[PDB]
Amino acid sequence: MLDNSFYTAEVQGPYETASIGRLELEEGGVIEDCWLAYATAGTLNEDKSNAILIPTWYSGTHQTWFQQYIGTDHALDPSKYFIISINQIGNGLSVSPANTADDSISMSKFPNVRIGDDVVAQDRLLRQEFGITELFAVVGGSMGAQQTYEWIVRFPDQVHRAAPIAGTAKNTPHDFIFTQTLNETVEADPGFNGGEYSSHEEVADGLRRQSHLWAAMGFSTEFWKQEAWRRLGLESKESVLADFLDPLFMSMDPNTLLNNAWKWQHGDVSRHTGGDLAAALGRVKAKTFVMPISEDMFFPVRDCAAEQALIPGSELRVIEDIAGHLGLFNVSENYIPQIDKNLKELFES
Amino acid sequence: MLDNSFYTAEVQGPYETASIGRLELEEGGVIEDCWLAYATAGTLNEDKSNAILIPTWYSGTHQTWFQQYIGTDHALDPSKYFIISINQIGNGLSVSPANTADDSISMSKFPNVRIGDDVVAQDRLLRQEFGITELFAVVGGSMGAQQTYEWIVRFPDQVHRAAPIAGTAKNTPHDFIFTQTLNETVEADPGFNGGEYSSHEEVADGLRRQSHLWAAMGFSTEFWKQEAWRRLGLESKESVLADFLDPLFMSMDPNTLLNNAWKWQHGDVSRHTGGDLAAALGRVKAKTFVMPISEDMFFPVRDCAAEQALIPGSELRVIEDIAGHLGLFNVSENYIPQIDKNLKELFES
């Protein structure tokens, strides 16, 4: 069990942690004491029908959602809905390699968690702590979109609306390759010590290298060419890395990243139908708005549009953002307005 | 001076090496004995007017051109033209960090060579060895396209036709960032030893990591999603790396790669006009066919099309290839046919 000031309430914002008990993973592993970290906003109504679930994405928590997406002047209105965000397993806030009390699964002994394991865990938490059996809507970005797809496919009758933003239901081979390069440069750091490091500050070089890898793929060529980072109040291109991206990733836990990266690499909702993705997404009953980002480099529109054509009664709402995938951080002026417009229309139907 | 069987005539094909003497570089450095490696095909006519120059690209030599692009049944016909390919400085075949006899510039002491330095060197070789003062055409890919742009801007009256394939005239900030990640993972290898290694086999891990970085950026999402590597006779996605890309890069010299990577990072033909790219490309007198690859991830059409709109009398001929940038290796069925069609039309006018 390590100490990282980044993974605290003082940084990520207020949140609670409840345990759902023994969780048997699909890959074989077992988490004896599986506890999740969640944050809520708003009041659950009488018949518990205004609940909205928000899964976190890679290298992220609930913080971004509560400080960019959630508000009374937004679609995700805590005045109308009970908005709950549950952190991924091993994401650093929930039960993770570098914070678990269990010695059998501590650090490099932490098991492999699939997206399906998260959704199973989330459903258990929602029932146990709030008695929620149906969700008004499920909204998530990147890996959160993967969990969104898993939710509406695994528990079709438990979700009314879905908003998978910038993410696919079945991971494409290119996504795997890219994610592999992310893991390699981190494992390349000798300070990593095969997952048995004493501090995340020892793997500082590897974390910084991954940061640069995100600068290359997580944005767009036009983002850099037009210097769109200027509206963020940054001086130069190099300042974008050294004063923003690099400090961010260097503050994170390598084991946590590697864990969620694996989860990301094996996202596949077609596991429920023996591989037939068309048959899997055919199960979808929820009203779905597939919302990719226009300039998303590793989650391109064509990939998302292909899946959207398999989801019955769904619509494709492309979000125009020059910042590409990392536009999820709300670094563009017109990003949130587009998000709110589409989500409001989704919440109306 | 090291020994690498990869950088030999037995692998890259037959070639000659001549010295152009003292070469003072723009960055300040000096190469006392500057010798280049070149390969030729065809016969130079009476008035020396059928010469075609082909600069090499990153991590490459003349081999690909002579085994994919050049032939009697191709546009680059050695029956009509004297086709000469001159290897970049420090590319492994020409005077390089790991083959120079000069101790003052050996290995990690090797100076910084710009694209402009290559073109100056190439012009000297062409005059010294063949008395060529004008070129029928200049054709190059990637960094070869950069040298193509430099040629038609620096020596406007010495080039009649130009075919910059999949490359820009002025390096965009995104290209710099991507190239930086390539250099980092190589320098991350402890076996690299700050450029003072005894064998390229010591930096095997870093070279392999760069290979994977190319698999992520050098192709396209559709290339992997449609498994276009099957026509190459490869079994699986993993086989594409382990049995093709990884062995290729692991066979190369780290210092050579780092040198050409720097050169790539500082490609700027607007240096001749104080930064005004529009004014620089305005100097172009040669008939130019800007030919980007449709799915090129880090040399996208929009970037190339922007430059093409500044070159007077030029045309834009986009090459349709799912393989993206690495389509230059002729891994697609319809690649060379497109290349030959456009080049023939260029050679006609």
Residue of chain B whose alpha carbon sits nearest to that of A213: B181
CB A289, CB A317: distance < 8 Å: yes
Picking from B189, B221, B303, the nearest residue to A300 by CB comes out as: B221
Tokens 């797809």 belong to which residue? A149
Mutate to test the interface with B, among A179, A219, A225 (most CBs of B within 10 A): A225
Cβ-Cβ contacts under 8 Å for A103 (sequence gap 6 or more): none
Cβ-Cβ contacts under 8 Å for A17 (sequence gap 6 or more): A35, A36, A37, A38, A93, A94
Q: Does A178 touch chain B (CB under 8 A)?
A: yes
Active site residue A94: no
User: How many C-beta atoms lie closer than 10 Å to residue A22's C-beta?
Assistant: 10
Q: Cβ–Cβ of B188/A188 closer than 8 Å? A: yes
User: How many C-beta atoms lie closer than 10 Å to residue B67's C-beta?
Assistant: 12
Which residue type is seen at B120?
A: V
Three-state SS annotation for chain B: CCCCCCCCHHHHCCCEEEEEEEEECCCCCEEEEEEEEEEEECCCCCCCCCEEECCCCCCCCCHHHHHHHECCCCCECCCCCEEEEECCCCCCCCCCCCCCCCCCCCHHHCCCCCHHHHHHHHHHHHHHHHCCCCECEEEEECHHHHHHHHHHHHCHHHECEEEEECCCCECCHHHHHHHHHHHHHHHCCHHHHHHCCCCHHHHHHHHHHHHHHHHHHCCCHHHHHCCHHHHHCCCCHHHHHHHHHHHHHCCCCHHHHHHHHHHHHCCEHHHHHCCCHHHHHHCCCCEEEEECECCCCCCCHHHHHHHHCCCCCCEECCECCCCHHHHHHCCCCCHHHHHHHHHHHHHHC
Rounded to an integer, what distance in angstroms lies between the CA atom of residue B49 and that of residue B266?
A: 32
Among A37, A44, A34, A47, which residue's Cα sits nearest to residue A12? A37
Q: Which of A59, A94, A106, A142 is catalytic?
A: A142
Which residue type is seen at B50?
A: N
CB B252, CB B6: distance < 8 Å: yes
Quick one: tokens of A50? 């205004």
Burial grade of A74 (CB within 10 A; 0-12, 13-18, 19 or more) = middle
Among B91, B102, B114, which residue's Cα sits nearest to residue B37? B91
- The three-point CA angle A269-A124-A122 to 5° equals 50
Q: Which of B77, B94, B325, B332 is catalytic?
A: B325
CB B223, CB B324: distance < 8 Å: yes
Beta partners for residue B40, in sequence order: B84
Rounded to an integer, what distance in angstroms lies between the CA atom of residue B258 and that of residue B242?
A: 22
Torsion, CA A121, CA A122, CA A128, CA A129, rounded to 10: 140
Quick one: tokens of B278? 């529009």
Q: For strands B30-41 and B51-53, give the pairing.
A: unpaired
Residue of chain B whose alpha carbon sits nearest to that of A178: B216
Which residue type is seen at B168?
A: T
DSSP 8-state symbol, A171 = -
Q: For strands B51-53 and B137-141, give the pairing.
A: parallel
Residues in chain B, how many? 349
Rounded to an integer, what distance in angstroms lies between the CA atom of residue B249 and that of residue B6?
A: 10
Name the domain count of chain A: 1
- The 3-state DSSP class for residue A49 equals coil
Rounded to an integer, what distance in angstroms lies between the CA atom of residue A261 and that of residue A223?
A: 25
Region for residue A4 given its phi and psi (left: phi exceeds 0; alpha: psi -120 to 50; beta: otherwise): beta
Tell me the structure's resolution in angstroms, rounded to a single decimal: 3.2
Among A99, A46, A26, A18, which residue's Cα sits nearest to residue A266? A26
CATH of the domain at A330: 3.40.50.1820
CB B272, CB B283: distance < 8 Å: yes
Rounded to an integer, what distance in angstroms lies between the CA atom of residue A308 and that of residue A306?
A: 6
Q: Cβ–Cβ of A212/B185 closer than 8 Å? A: no
H-only helix segments in chain A = 9-12, 63-64, 115-130, 143-154, 173-187, 204-217, 221-225, 237-240, 246-249, 254-265, 277-282, 301-308, 335-348
Cβ-Cβ contacts under 8 Å for A117 (sequence gap 6 or more): A23, A25, A26, A89
Burial grade of B5 (CB within 10 A; 0-12, 13-18, 19 or more) = exposed
CB A346, CB A161: distance < 8 Å: yes
Q: Does B294 touch chain A (CB under 8 A)?
A: no
List, edge to edge, every strand of the sheet that includes B161-165. B16-24, B30-41, B82-86, B51-53, B137-141, B161-165, B287-290, B315-316
Torsion, CA A220, CA A224, CA A228, CA A229, rounded to 10: 110
Collect all residues of chain A within an 8 Å Cβ-Cβ radius of residue B224.
Answer: 172-174, 177
Residues in chain A, how many? 349
Picking from B177, B215, B219, the nearest residue to A224 by CB comes out as: B177
Rounded to an integer, what distance in angstroms lies between the CA atom of residue A168 and that of residue A311?
A: 12
Quick one: tokens of A307? 């899946």
Active site residue B200: no
Quick one: tokens of B48? 């020396």
- The 3-state DSSP class for residue A1 equals coil
Quick one: tokens of A280? 């899997």
Task: Please report the number of interchain residue pairs, chain A to chain B, with beta-carbon separation below 8 angstroms.
Answer: 85
Q: For strands A137-141 and A51-53, give the pairing.
A: parallel
Rounded to an integer, what distance in angstroms lies between the CA atom of residue A10 and that of residue A70?
A: 19
Which residue type is seen at B299?
A: F
Q: For strands A82-86 and A137-141, give the pairing.
A: unpaired
User: How many C-beta atoms lie closer than 10 Å to residue A338's C-beta?
Assistant: 18
Which residue range forms the structural domain that includes residue A326?
Answer: 1-349
Rounded to an integer, what distance in angstroms lies between the CA atom of residue A81 and that of residue A76?
A: 7
Rounded to an integer, what distance in angstroms lies between the CA atom of residue B285 and that of residue B266?
A: 24
Rounded to an integer, what distance in angstroms lies between the CA atom of residue A300 and that of residue B297?
A: 12
Cβ-Cβ contacts under 8 Å for B202 (sequence gap 6 or more): B189, B191, B192, B193
Handedness of CA A141, A142, A143, A145 (dihedral sign): positive
Q: Does B194 touch chain A (CB under 8 A)?
A: no
Rounded to an integer, what distance in angstroms lies between the CA atom of residue B277 and that of residue B271?
A: 8
Q: Cβ–Cβ of A222/B297 closer than 8 Å? A: no
Rounded to an integer, what distance in angstroms lies between the CA atom of residue B307 and that of residue B276?
A: 12
Among B292, B291, B287, which residue's Cα sits nearest to residue B136? B287
User: How many C-beta atoms lie closer than 10 Å to residue B7's C-beta?
Assistant: 24
Collect all residues of chain A within an 8 Å Cβ-Cβ radius of residue B227.
Answer: 173
- The 3-state DSSP class for residue A229 equals helix
Distances, alpha carbon A306 to alpha carbons A112, A139, A154, A164, B225, in Å: 29, 20, 20, 14, 12
The rounded Cα B19 to chain-centroid distance in angstroms is: 20
Among A191, A190, A188, which residue's Cα sits nearest to residue A180? A188
- The Cα of B156 is separated from the nearest Cα of chain A by a number of Å equal to 28
CB A95, CB A36: distance < 8 Å: yes
Q: Cβ–Cβ of B216/A185 closer than 8 Å? A: no
- The Cα of B221 is separated from the nearest Cα of chain A by a number of Å equal to 6
Collect all residues of chain A within an 8 Å Cβ-Cβ radius of residue B303.
Answer: 221, 225
Quick one: tokens of A33? 């004491």
Q: Which of B96, B142, B220, B314 is catalytic?
A: B142
Which residue type is seen at B40?
A: T
